[PDB]
Amino acid sequence: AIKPDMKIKLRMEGNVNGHHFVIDGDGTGKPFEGKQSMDLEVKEGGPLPFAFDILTTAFNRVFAKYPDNIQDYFKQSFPKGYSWERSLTFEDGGICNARNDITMEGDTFYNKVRFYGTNFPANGPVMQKKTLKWEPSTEKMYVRDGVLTGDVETALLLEGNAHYRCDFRTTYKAKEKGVKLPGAHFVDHCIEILSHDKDYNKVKLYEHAVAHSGL
């Protein structure tokens, strides 16, 4: 069902601290290598009055290198596809809820992303655009009450030698009942903005992910 080379199409609608936006994306990826890259364009609501870095994890764990000895819930979820819901809890009270419904049509993944942020202090690094990047992290994958859950404790690097900490919890659901849940495992991941324009209206985003058993 999943080819070595797949295309990505995206539309995100969202609101952060009452600021509405629409962002489209177009990319490609190698699902078996665990690599994806995409071109994002802000279509409505630009220039965004907050840190683009808070959105970038919302922009598909199908693009993760799974070893033979871990059940790949994401590749086995196609062709019908899967959804996730995610909460982002920042150390200064900032909260985001994001969701993605992922479908496949031929060689293309379609992504319907919704992203809601609130409670970002006006004086903080998100609304003042002081963020520099996400630090690489390990996602803890396990089952909670019959649902595949993933946790991440990570941080944004800020200007001036500081980190801004964020906890992610993500729930994953296949559309097909019957897709067996995997055992617990880890996903190492790195996400980078490769290029941007002045106000992050156009952004090239890269993500690489590798699943492992912690050895």
Residue numbers in the entry: 3 to 61, 63 to 218
Article, verbatim:
Based on the EosFP sequence, we developed a new reversibly photoswitching rs-FP, ‘rsKiiro’ (described in detail in Supplementary Discussion 10). Reversible photoswitching occurs between a bright fluorescent cis anionic p-hydroxybenzylideneimidazolinone (HBDI) chromophore (the ‘on’ state) and the non-fluorescent trans neutral (the ‘off’ state), as is also the case for the rs-FP ‘Dronpa’. Compared to Dronpa, rsKiiro has substantially improved structural ordering in the ‘on’ ground state as well as the ‘off’ photoproduct, allowing high-resolution X-ray crystallography of the photoreactions. Illumination of the ‘on’ state with green light drives a cis–trans photoisomerization of the chromophore to produce a metastable non-fluorescent ‘off’ state with a neutral trans chromophore.
An ~100-fs pump interaction at 400 nm, close to resonance of the trans neutral chromophore (off state), creates an excited-state population with a lifetime of τ = 50 ps in both solution and crystals. A power density of 1,400 GW cm−2 (full-width at half-maximum, FWHM) was chosen for PP experiments to maximize the photoisomerization yield, based on optical measurements in crystals of anionic cis product absorption. The pump–probe observations up to 1-ps delay showed strong Fo–Fo difference electron-density features, up to 8.5σ, on the chromophore and on a hydrogen-bonded water and throughout the core of the protein. Coordinate refinement from extrapolated structure factors and occupancy refinement showed a small translational motion of the chromophore characterized by a 69-pm displacement of the phenolic oxygen. A 1.25-Å coordinate change of a nearby hydrogen-bonded water molecule modifies the O–O distance between the chromophore and water from 2.63 Å to 3.06 Å. A concomitant repositioning of the Gly155 backbone carbonyl changes its O–O distance to this water molecule from 2.77 Å to 2.84 Å. This observation forms our primary motivation for assigning the structural changes observed in the PP conditions to dominating ground-state motion, which is unconnected to the photoisomerization reaction coordinate. The excited-state coherence is not impulsively prepared; it is purely displacement-driven and insufficiently ordered, whereas the cis anionic chromophore product state is seen after full electronic and population decay and thermal proton transfer.
